[PDB]
Design an enzyme around this catalytic site. Structure first.
Site, PDB file in Angstrom:
ATOM      1  N   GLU A   1      32.021  38.725  31.089  1.00  0.00           N
ATOM      2  CA  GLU A   1      33.165  38.188  31.817  1.00  0.00           C
ATOM      3  C   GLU A   1      33.446  36.772  31.319  1.00  0.00           C
ATOM      4  O   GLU A   1      33.036  35.773  31.912  1.00  0.00           O
ATOM      5  CB  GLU A   1      32.909  38.230  33.317  1.00  0.00           C
ATOM      6  CG  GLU A   1      34.109  37.866  34.160  1.00  0.00           C
ATOM      7  CD  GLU A   1      35.146  38.967  34.191  1.00  0.00           C
ATOM      8  OE1 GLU A   1      34.763  40.148  34.082  1.00  0.00           O
ATOM      9  OE2 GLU A   1      36.345  38.652  34.331  1.00  0.00           O
ATOM     10  N   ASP A   2      34.135  36.697  30.183  1.00  0.00           N
ATOM     11  CA  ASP A   2      34.669  35.452  29.628  1.00  0.00           C
ATOM     12  C   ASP A   2      33.584  34.411  29.358  1.00  0.00           C
ATOM     13  O   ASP A   2      33.869  33.211  29.316  1.00  0.00           O
ATOM     14  CB  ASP A   2      35.748  34.867  30.548  1.00  0.00           C
ATOM     15  CG  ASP A   2      36.704  33.943  29.818  1.00  0.00           C
ATOM     16  OD1 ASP A   2      37.649  33.439  30.460  1.00  0.00           O
ATOM     17  OD2 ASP A   2      36.521  33.731  28.602  1.00  0.00           O
ATOM     18  N   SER A   3      32.339  34.841  29.180  1.00  0.00           N
ATOM     19  CA  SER A   3      31.245  33.924  28.900  1.00  0.00           C
ATOM     20  C   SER A   3      30.954  33.897  27.399  1.00  0.00           C
ATOM     21  O   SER A   3      31.733  34.403  26.587  1.00  0.00           O
ATOM     22  CB  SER A   3      30.021  34.301  29.724  1.00  0.00           C
ATOM     23  OG  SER A   3      30.298  34.121  31.097  1.00  0.00           O
TER      24      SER A   3
ATOM     25  N   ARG B   1      44.586  37.948  27.322  1.00  0.00           N
ATOM     26  CA  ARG B   1      45.001  36.576  27.071  1.00  0.00           C
ATOM     27  C   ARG B   1      45.973  36.497  25.903  1.00  0.00           C
ATOM     28  O   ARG B   1      46.861  35.638  25.894  1.00  0.00           O
ATOM     29  CB  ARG B   1      43.777  35.701  26.806  1.00  0.00           C
ATOM     30  CG  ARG B   1      43.088  35.190  28.061  1.00  0.00           C
ATOM     31  CD  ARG B   1      42.224  36.248  28.726  1.00  0.00           C
ATOM     32  NE  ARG B   1      41.495  35.701  29.861  1.00  0.00           N
ATOM     33  CZ  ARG B   1      40.342  35.051  29.766  1.00  0.00           C
ATOM     34  NH1 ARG B   1      39.760  34.846  28.597  1.00  0.00           N
ATOM     35  NH2 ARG B   1      39.764  34.591  30.872  1.00  0.00           N
TER      36      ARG B   1
END
Lengths: 1132, 98, 90, 50, 67, 50, 117
Positions: free
Chosen positions: A763-765, A933
């Site tokens: 998750e976006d890490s 994104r």
């Protein structure tokens, strides 16, 4: 000659010339310079002289004038009664928490007449009014024009743009404040009101003491129908316009209609003007109309001749000041008011269209100059109205007076210092009334952040408002306001920065334009009759209707010709010809935002190979941007003039023979990338990203840590962040060399592999390379500074010393041996949480300490310790502490495309995947962050970075280059032995098996943000408590507790965990017991040790109940009882 | 009724009194002044303005903000925090502390 | 909902000294035929035939709304022009 | 799609475009332009997925 | 500030290559020729010098704290 | 853009993708379009939470 | 139909108001300030165009031709002088019920011709 296919270098050469001649805080510097040069002079000179009598007699009184002029201003000085005064270095002001101000001086001439007709005038030269805070790198700052070697000798950064004030040793930056333009007519139509259309023109004289006197001319929204009213300043009720004209002096009706409808052959205008005419057929002469206005005035006169004078004064000064306030300006005011009515009728008939409020042509920017002028004018009036009081107090007795004692030098300097230090823009008494947010503390975390804070606008409309129309990006923001850069919080679109070449006009006198205009073929209003006014065109200068011209053409050409040679009209002045509607307006006031554009004749630029050549050899031929402007090659175009002009994006692609689109261009843009700001000009390939990504990158560019300034070691500053090994990006825009980003970068060109390796980046890490971090990857050091000053009473003297246990009473368990005997730590000593740093004790009427403790869980090392004297002559100490921040998991990292993320895990080089070579990615991000994104600019950056690092060149990521694309980059990469699309065959770091899919990998410029996890992590277990209600404190620093808020309470209700809800809100926050009488539910008095429980008001003493309560509940009950409410709580 | 020290705590050398304590001090000043005037002087004119000002002070003790009336301000011009404002809404006693 | 604004093109008032005089050349009033100040409104065929009204319906609406304080004289649905004249009775 | 938008603009300029019932000329021109652009975007997207 | 001792990715020594790299750039050598004249074959090591900004020189222009 | 230009390029249509990049007009239009969503995200919270 | 236009008293320059000379049963315009009378020649007092079918060509002025920001086409020539180039634009007017119709203005100044197609 004409320059073909050399544009990609010629345009950037002229841009480099522009950014060499003009800096990046040029609007700040010019506004402050113009302020302290001429606006302070005009404010100090236009103040009327004060004449003052005695108390009208003594027995059964002469006065004086005291007029002053010719202000003098000196360079900053510093010492007072202890040595001969010396200039203030700005770095010394920062270190000693002084105010980097400059004293201003005036010479006064007091001429006094008493008796016998003998006049003596005494002049006092260099009279001291106060000390004005002065902006750094200004024309009277001590760093003006100094070379880089001298700046380094003065411990100043040569790259520091300046443009900020040093007050109490803290950088202050005046944020530009938007406002509606003045002296211009706006026709609006509010939806739900008694009137349909309304025309307003807020008016101001040339920086007079009077505020914006706004006048509305409105039309009712439905007998007869559609009457026209004009609500007037200092008038309680609306007044019909015809009554206004008759009061202004027009007895007849044909004369009045000559000032509104300019062509009598248009009966549609008459049909709507007669409903207002027949409203006022009972007033026929000037005096009855004056009486009618005076009756509606805020101060209604008791007699007729008092209302006459009051309304005459209102018409003379309050209404339309900008068109003139003199003995006879009635004809000019009538012409302008009739023009306002004509403008309202044009909107009512639909001949024209309603003016747009968000059109930034209608906006003006209040920079440091105008803001300081507005505030200094008020303080100067306050100073005069106390010199007057002192003079009265001495002349009532009539002995004599001294102007040196009369002048209160404190008021001006203290008002300026308070306003700039706090942000409350106004008098200190009206702290809540004055608008705040102006003069913020300069953000000094990154050089890009400093530039962005020094180039920032502000819309002074209320926040948290559901009207999104002001917040939206308006079409007129092209090239003057950065579209990407804006905060994401409750200030979206309200706080907007400034484009690169966008320049704000500073203002000049329109008088030379007036004398130039009056001598070609135009006529002033007083000369002509309205017979010939309909076919000709109306000239406006700074919004005031100056005259009439028969030939708009060849006067527009003449004005442009003069502006292109700077003969009389300066470059900042904008001339605007409205063509379908005959107005021709000239603007000269300050605050007009404008940007430079090229000049285009038939279809060719005036920029030539000779210009490019003689400007390329600069620093020897000194052919600068100013010479380029003087050559008549470029113009400054604001929004008004941008409406009436035709631009071309690129001369080559938009000025050629083809299927014709316009073939009538007037200007061309130097380079479209200049529409971006400062933080958005560091984004590589910003047109390949979704715009919210660009906005987020513009926001996070202010948080990326790097060398924020060169002199960061002399700069004793709190919350200073510098990176060990900053790097200029491998792929860069051509606009970074002008932001000096390649000299003070914030980030490291990391090798990222966009792959799902283990799942710790899901998750976006992000995964980081532990070995790289060990080698110094994104390693930084955190500077925090601690200040303290000794003093405050008659005997309670503060002193720095080592507190000794038998002497001083109050002490922590902290060890005080780390202090030196003067009360401070020597630099270079390891320190930790709850360790004393400054040993300070106050005398106890033995002693009690006020020692400063190091902030809990900091655990750093003291860098340097400075001791000096503040402006009160007391010992002053500032201590700066180093603490390095090795990148750990949870530290927030981000790229140049709004792809933020915290480190999820750190693998060593062995655990990390690797190429056919030993290349292991420094960073691994989740591929699931791209598709929604849509940061295709991130992928193109990662590709071009590999291409550049293999080629040896620095990659070029100019937004609209059009000379580089994905296919060319791929073909270039394929030549170096890599897959053309950047993919590589990585091998698993644990098993050694090659990954079935091929990994996209390459160098990408990542940034480390200030949001470390060690600065956010905190817990609590029955720590400190607030004083009013015995609940846990708030804040990480105060060892506070988290808020179990109203929504968490609701969530627990939904869970149906009533015992857990009570545990959270009662025992975990503030368990408390109170005693309440069983008869009356009022709190009783309990004496537990003697077990005497009595409730007065009942005399029972026997039946008493103990009830357990939250302390907040008890205190609410006590407040209610203080409000005479009686909450009675019977337990039965 | 004058609230106790717990409702209006006074901190030590920032002793500093509470915003409500200042209003209570004004209340007792004007009440004593009005009392002593009403026995000794009994002018019946200054008494009217005295009662008017005491009414304003006691009203702004519980409710600082009123339409058409001046706000009670402590030194430096900042308005006082009345009991209503102390328990009005968000970050108030009930909604922000219960 | 339909008001009489929706159907009319323009409205004009004249001072005809005699209703028989017919200051405007209209033989319909000549063949059809007490105040000299009259009212004249011109409708359009477009909205008229869009909403399916008649001069008789419009006139009876006027007579019901205002009573016999005024008499409407409407042109027949044969001419290209859509005229009804309004007087005020005494 | 651009040629279709241009020819729709031509029809609107030469008064050759009949307004859609329940809509005025401006909104029906807007509807035609939006329909053409949305159809073009959908077709290009479908070609992309194919 | 100063050139890192080792490449973050590779770990190959880069700390001794900066002065030689500047000397080679003080000649007809381009960056692409200087990098592989210094023996930087991997772009991980090449970027270490290619993208490095040497701020220690700007830091040394300030007078020291002592003497 | 020329006055009264209702063409797709003059009113916000972006015929380029995220790969070919956006021409400066299209970049500004896309920024202005995304600004609306960014504003809505912030404004909606103060109503939805209430 | 036409439009009624306000005309003013020659004595005191004020707005006339309609009146009926009851004796002669003839329209008279009367100034309420002074005793001046005058006989009306139009016989119409008030006209109101609700459909508002307006000829925008009258409000279009000739100098609009030298606007750099207006489109230019040689396909439609001018009618009097036969000039090849013409400048065209839309109504640019509020309350234009349904009008995308183009209004053309001829260049080659001193012509100033305006037409609609």
């Amino acid at each position: 000659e004409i320059t073909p296919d050399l544009w990609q270098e010629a345009c950037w050469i002229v841009i480099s010339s522009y950014f060499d001649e003009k800096g990046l805080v040029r609007q700040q510097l010019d506004s402050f310079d113009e302020f302290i040069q001429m606006s302070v002079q005009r404010i100090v000179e236009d103040a009327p002289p004060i004449d003052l009598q005695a108390e009208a007699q003594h027995a059964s009184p002469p006065r004086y004038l005291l007029k002053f002029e010719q202000i003098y201003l000196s360079k900053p000085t510093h010492w007072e009664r202890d040595g001969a005064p010396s200039p203030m270095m700005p770095n010394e002001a920062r270190l000693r928490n002084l105010t980097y101000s400059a004293p201003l001086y005036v010479d006064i001439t007091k001429t006094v007449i008493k008796e016998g007709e003998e006049q003596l005038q005494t002049q006092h030269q260099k009279t001291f009014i106060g000390k004005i805070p002065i902006m750094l790198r200004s024309t009277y700052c001590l760093l003006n024009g100094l070379t880089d070697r001298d700046l380094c000798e003065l411990n100043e950064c040569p790259l520091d743009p300046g443009g900020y004030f040093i007050i109490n040793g803290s950088e202050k930056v005046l944020i530009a404040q938007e406002k509606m333009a003045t002296n211009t007519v706006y026709v609006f139509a509010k939806k739900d009101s008694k009137y349909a259309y309304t025309g307003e023109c807020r008016s101001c004289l040339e920086n007079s003491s009077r505020p914006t006197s706004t006048i509305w001319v409105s039309m009712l929204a439905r007998a007869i129908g559609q009457r026209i009213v004009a609500t007037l300043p200092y008038i309680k009720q609306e007044v019909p316009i015809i009554i206004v004209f008759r009061a202004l002096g027009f007895v007849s009706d044909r004369d009045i209609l000559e000032h509104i409808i300019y062509d009598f052959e248009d009966p549609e205008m008459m049909e709507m003007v007669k409903p207002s005419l027949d409203e006022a057929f009972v007033i026929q002469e000037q005096n009855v109309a004056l009486n009618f206005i005076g009756s509606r005035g805020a101060k209604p006169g008791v007699t007729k001749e008092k209302r006459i004078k009051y309304a005459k004064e209102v018409l003379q000064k309050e209404m339309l000041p900008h068109v003139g306030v003199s003995d006879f300006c009635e004809t000019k005011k009538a012409y302008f008011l009739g023009y306002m009515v004509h403008r309202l009728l044009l909107a009512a008939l639909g001949r024209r269209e309603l003016d747009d409020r968000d059109h930034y042509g209608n906006k003006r920017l209040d920079l440091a100059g105008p803001l300081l002028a507005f505030l200094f004018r008020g303080m100067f009036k306050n100073l005069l109205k106390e010199v007057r009081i002192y003079a009265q107090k001495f002349i009532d007795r009539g002995k004599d007076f001294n102007l040196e004692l009369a002048i209160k030098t404190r008021i001006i300097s203290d008002g300026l210092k308070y306003s700039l230090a706090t942000g409350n823009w106004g008098d200190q008494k009206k702290a809540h009334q004055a608008r705040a947010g102006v003069s913020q503390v300069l953000n000094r975390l990154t050089f890009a952040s400093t530039l962005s804070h020094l180039r920032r606008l502000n819309s002074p409309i209320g926040r948290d408002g559901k009207l999104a129309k002001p917040r939206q990006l308006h079409n007129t923001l092209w090239g003057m306001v950065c579209p990407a850069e804006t905060p994401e919080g409750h200030a979206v679109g309200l706080v907007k920065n400034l484009a690169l070449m966008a320049y704000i006009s500073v203002g000049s006198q329109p008088s030379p334009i007036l004398e130039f205009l009056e001598e070609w073929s135009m006529e002033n209003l007083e000369e002509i009759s309205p017979a010939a006014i309909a076919d000709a065109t109306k000239i406006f200068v700074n919004g005031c209707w100056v005259g009439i011209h028969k030939d708009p053409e060849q006067l527009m050409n003449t004005l442009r010709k003069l502006r292109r040679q700077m003969d009389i009209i300066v470059s900042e002045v904008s001339m605007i010809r409205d063509i379908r509607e005959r107005e021709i307006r000239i603007y000269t006031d300050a605050g007009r935002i404008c940007r430079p554009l090229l000049i285009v004749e038939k279809q060719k630029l005036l920029l030539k190979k000779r210009h490019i050549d003689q400007l390329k050899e600069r620093e020897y031929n000194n052919y600068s941007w100013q010479d380029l402007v003087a050559s008549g090659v470029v113009e400054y175009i604001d929004t008004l003039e941008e409406e009436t002009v035709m631009l071309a994006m690129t001369p080559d692609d938009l000025q050629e023979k083809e299927v014709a689109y316009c073939s009538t261009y007037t200007h061309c843009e130097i380079h479209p990338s200049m529409i971006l700001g400062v933080c958005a000009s560091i984004i590589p390939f910003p047109d390949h990203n979704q715009s919210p990504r660009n906005t987020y990158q513009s926001a996070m560019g202010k948080q990326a840590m790097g060398v924020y300034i060169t002199n960061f070691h002399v700069r004793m500053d709190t919350l200073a962040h510098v990176l060990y090994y900053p790097q200029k990006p491998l792929v860069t825009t051509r606009s970074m060399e002008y932001l000096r980003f390649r000299e003070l970068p914030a980030g490291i060109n990391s090798i990222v592999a966009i792959a799902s390796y283990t799942g710790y980046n899901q998750e976006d890490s992000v995964i980081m390379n532990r070995s790289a971090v060990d080698r110094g990857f994104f390693r930084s050091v955190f500077y925090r500074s601690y200040k303290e000053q000794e003093s405050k009473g008659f005997d309670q003297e503060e002193v720095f010393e080592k507190p000794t246990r038998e002497t001083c009473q109050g002490m922590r368990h902290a060890i005080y041996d780390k202090l030196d005997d003067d009360g401070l730590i020597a630099p270079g000593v390891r320190v930790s949480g709850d360790d004393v740093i400054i040993g300070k004790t106050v005398t106890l009427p033995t002693k009690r300490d006020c020692s400063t403790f190091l902030r809990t869980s900091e655990t750093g090392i003291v860098d340097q310790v400075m001791v000096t004297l503040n402006q009160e002559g007391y010992k002053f100490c500032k201590i700066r502490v180093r603490s390095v921040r090795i990148p750990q998991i949870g530290d927030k990292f981000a790229s140049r495309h709004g792809q933020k993320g915290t480190c999820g895990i750190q693998y060593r080089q062995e655990d990390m995947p690797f190429t056919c070579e030993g290349i292991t990615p420094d960073i691994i991000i989740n591929p699931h962050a791209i598709p929604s994104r849509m940061t295709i600019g991130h992928l193109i950056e990662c590709l071009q970075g590999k291409v550049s690092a293999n080629k040896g060149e620095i990659g070029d990521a100019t937004p609209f280059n059009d000379a580089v694309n994905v296919q060319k980059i791929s073909n270039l990469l394929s030549d170096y032995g890599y897959h053309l699309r950047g993919n590589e065959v990585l091998y698993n770091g644990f098993t050694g098996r090659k990954i079935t899919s091929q990994i996209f990998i390459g160098p990408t410029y990542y940034q480390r943000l200030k949001h470390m996890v060690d600065d956010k992590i905190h817990s609590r277990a029955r720590g400190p408590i607030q004083i009013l209600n015995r609940q846990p404190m708030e804040g990480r620093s105060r060892d506070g507790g988290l808020r179990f808020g109203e929504m968490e309470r609701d969530c627990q209700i939904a869970h149906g965990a009533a015992q857990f809800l009570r545990e959270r809100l009662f025992e975990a926050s503030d368990p408390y017991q109170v005693h309440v009488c069983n008869l009356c539910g009022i709190m009783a008095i309990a004496n537990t040790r003697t077990h005497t429980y009595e409730c007065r008001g009942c005399r029972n003493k026997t039946q008493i109940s103990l009830v357990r309560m939250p302390y907040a509940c008890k205190l609410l009950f006590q407040e209610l009882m203080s409000m005479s409410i009686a909450p009675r709580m019977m337990s039965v | 009724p004058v609230p106790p020290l717990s409702v209006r705590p006074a901190v030590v050398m920032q002793r500093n009194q509470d915003d409500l304590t200042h209003k209570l001090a004004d209340i007792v000043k004007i009440n004593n002044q009005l009392r002593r005037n009403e026995q000794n002087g009994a002018a019946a004119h200054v008494i009217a303005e005295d009662v008017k000002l005491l009414q304003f002070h006691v009203a702004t003790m519980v409710d600082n903000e009123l339409p058409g009336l001046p706000r009670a301000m402590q030194k430096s011009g900042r308005p006082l925090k009345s009991l209503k404002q102390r328990l009005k809404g968000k970050e108030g006693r009930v909604r922000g502390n219960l | 909902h339909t008001t009489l604004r929706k159907v009319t093109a323009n409205t004009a008032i004249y001072y005809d000294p005699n209703p028989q005089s017919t200051v405007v050349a209209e033989d319909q009033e000549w063949v059809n035929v007490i105040s000299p100040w009259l009212l004249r409104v011109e409708l359009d065929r477009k909205h008229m035939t869009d909403r399916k009204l008649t001069m008789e319906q419009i006139a009876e609406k006027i007579n019901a709304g205002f009573g016999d304080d005024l008499n409407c004289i409407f042109n027949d649905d044969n001419a290209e022009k859509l005229v009804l004249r309004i007087r005020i009775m005494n | 799609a651009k040629q279709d938008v241009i020819e729709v603009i031509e029809k609107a300029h030469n008064n050759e475009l009949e307004p859609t019932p329940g809509n005025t000329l401006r909104q029906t021109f807007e509807n035609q332009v939006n329909r053409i652009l949305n159809d073009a975007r959908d077709k290009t997207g479908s070609s992309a997925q194919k | 500030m100063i050139i890192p001792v080792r490449c973050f990715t590779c770990g190959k020594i880069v700390g001794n290559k900066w002065e030689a790299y500047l000397g080679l750039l003080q000649a007809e050598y381009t960056e692409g020729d200087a990098l592989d004249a210094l023996g930087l074959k991997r772009y991980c090591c090449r970027r270490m010098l290619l993208a490095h900004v040497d701020l220690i020189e700007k830091l040394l222009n300030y007078a020291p704290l002592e003497k | 853009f020329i006055k009264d230009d209702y063409g797709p390029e003059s009113r916000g249509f972006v015929e380029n993708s995220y790969l070919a990049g956006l021409t400066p007009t299209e970049f500004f239009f896309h920024a202005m379009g995304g600004r609306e969503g960014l504003i809505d995200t912030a404004v909606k919270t103060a109503e939805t939470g209430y | 139909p036409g439009f009624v236009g306000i005309r003013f008293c020659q004595e005191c320059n004020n707005m006339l108001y309609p009146k009926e000379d009851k004796e002669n049963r003839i329209l008279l315009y009367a100034c309420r300030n002074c005793d001046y009378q005058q006989e009306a020649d139009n016989s119409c007092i008030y006209v109101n165009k609700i459909t508002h079918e307006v000829d925008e060509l009258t409000q279009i002025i000739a100098d609009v031709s030298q606007d750099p920001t207006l489109p230019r086409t040689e396909d439609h020539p001018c009618q009097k002088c036969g000039h090849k180039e013409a400048v065209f634009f839309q109504s640019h007017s509020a309350r234009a019920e349904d009008a995308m119709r183009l209004y053309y203005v001829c260049t080659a100044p001193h012509c100033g011709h305006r037409w609609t197609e």
